[PDB]
């Protein structure tokens, strides 16, 4: 008996992954973060920021959040903000999808469409919606924050004290690595802070795909984001504030076709339907586990469901323009 | 630490619903169903269903598992399915959410068209289904069963051995009535069995949906159906082996419109956002609650998500061309 959908956030189940396990001699992971009630990892960041407002007094009933984003963190947002009395605004390029505007439309999201640019233009959607946040605080008696998802660390916060603590309880103090990929990292750190405390001998890594950063910011010092993925929710070019004090012990670099292979198998052969941030996260588990040696518990994230990215992930014109492995169903 | 996705299957929260609740002095909880790795309530008979025939030796890796679908049976035999080594042969109606035919064909469903047809007609997807299954099983080796979910009572069983104690369980012994809509009956009725061996002067409520003749049936004798809905999943125009021997204490016809505004509401002011049957259960439960009395603890089932059906149920234009209301945000 809860109180409200917000109680069902979080204490997800980690669900062994089959082959990876038997490829490596290893017992590999992934915590169901789907099974949020928001379908999403984002659900804990989500709940963390509007509470931590609160908290604050920063939100009255009525008062509107602001956040720039085309992702996981806008549906996570809006589902915690309309249990709890609030409004959002997501700022959103014009230029994304009818769907991801549908989705955000459909729990209630006040979409604010901008024409798309990159990151130094301050009309970029992440940017602008700081000083949106601003001017509505002058005009919304109940308030108006911006959740910053990336540099906001109460975002790591919520993986220190929920998901680090759940998964040192759900493998009864025997996980020896963790690994996972950043957006804004708020994932990875904090679980790794949380777990560290717990086990200073636990060892972390980071997957990384092609377009990011920190693969090569980690490994060399080296200032550079090559290639590119259709992987979204993950791929990050600056050391955010959720990434500060971090240092992986191991990292990974993980090309699209990698993390498509696994993730098609996962459909096939283990009932799994999951989104391109868990072929990632999967394949970094499947080398973290081959560097540890056989004998060893590693947990990983299934970040979200593969539904939401049917038009590209799952989709073979797509899939075959950009030279990616097609899933064999689907011919 | 879980061996595969099938150990998330059910154990789901009861979420309370402060509207309904406050309205009707009564505790009312939504069972969420909507939480299940396959993301509806079919997980659970889904599961029984392939075990028994594995259980009777009828299916071995490789083989077949045969469905007649208005779609969320078909999502959960196929995850099932691919967790445990089967394929899956989807027999779907025209008609069907878009939703729930992208979802099955990502998770690797073959999936079989049919004109809709009633039920009195041959070509009917589940009598056609049942055909398909004794033409397969000439010639599938591994094996290739009927689902039968309409008439195979393992689907009531489902619900007898886990909804049941899980609600039980779950309200510490003070569960007064359960609610639900009926499509093959599993849910209503294995609950209701469950329940009343528990406590047997729990109360048992239909909420039927208009098109249906269950409630008819249960008031006056006769299965009568008049009206039409757009609601799907529910909606049943026989007893079914699932509905031998049930019989409600209470029978409710809900309106489309009447499920609407709840499920509208719902969104807006708890977070929520579910699918057509859900506002026909939560309908349910608020006349259950005031036919009992204030005081009372009343739970239903909230069965899937409202995303799986957004091209009609949340689509105005949609909606409005079959004169019900539209959600006020979209504008």
């Known amino acids: 008996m809860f109180n409200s959908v917000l109680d069902t956030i979080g204490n997800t189940p980690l669900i062994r992954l089959s082959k990876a ?22 659900d804990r960041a989500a709940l963390y920021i509007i509470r931590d407002a609160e908290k604050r007094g920063l939100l009255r009933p009525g008062g509107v959040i602001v956040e720039g984003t085309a992702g996981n963190t806008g549906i996570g947002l809006t ?40 990151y130094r233009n301050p009309n970029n959607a992440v940017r ?31 993986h220190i004290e929920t998901t680090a603590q ?26 790794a802070i949380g777990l ?28 550079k984001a090559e290639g590119d993925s259709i992987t979204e929710g993950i791929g990050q070019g600056r050391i955010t504030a959720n990434l500060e004090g971090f240092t992986p012990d191991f990292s990974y670099q993980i090309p699209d076709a ?36 056989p004998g060893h518990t590693i947990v990983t994230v299934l970040c979200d469901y593969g539904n939401r990215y049917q038009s590209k992930l799952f989709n073979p014109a797509f899939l075959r323009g950009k030279s990616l492995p097609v899933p064999r169903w689907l011919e």
Chains 1, 2 share one sequence.
């Not at 709890?84 to 729990?107: C, F, H, M, N, W």
């Not at 493998?171 to 996972?180: E, L, M, R």
């Not at 993390?259 to 588990?285: P, Q, R, T, Y």
């Open 21 to 42: 396990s038997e490829l490596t001699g290893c017992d590999i992971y992934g915590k169901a973060e789907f099974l949020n009630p928001g379908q999403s990892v984002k």
């Open 79 to 118: 589902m915690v903000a309309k249990a709890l009395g609030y409004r959002t605004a997501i700022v959103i390029p014009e230029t994304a999808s009818q769907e991801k505007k549908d989705a955000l439309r459909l729990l209630g999201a006040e979409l604010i469409e901008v024409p798309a640019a990159p």
């Open 128 to 158: 602008l919606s700081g000083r949106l946040a601003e001017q509505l605080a002058k005009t919304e008696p109940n308030g108006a924050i911006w959740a910053n998802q990336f540099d906001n660390t109460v975002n790591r916060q919520a």
């Open 166 to 191: 759940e998964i040192w309880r759900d493998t009864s103090d025997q996980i020896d690595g963790f690994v996972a990929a950043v957006g804004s990292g708020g994932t990875l750190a904090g679980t």
């Open 196 to 223: 560290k405390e717990r086990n200073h001998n636990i060892k972390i890594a980071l997957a990384d795909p092609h377009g990011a950063a920190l693969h090569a910011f980690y490994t060399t010092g080296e200032l």
């Open 258 to 293: 990698e993390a498509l292979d696994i993730l098609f198998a996962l459909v096939e052969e283990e009932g799994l339907c999951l989104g391109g941030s868990s072929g990632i996260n999967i394949a970094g588990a499947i080398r973290l586990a081959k560097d540890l040696g």
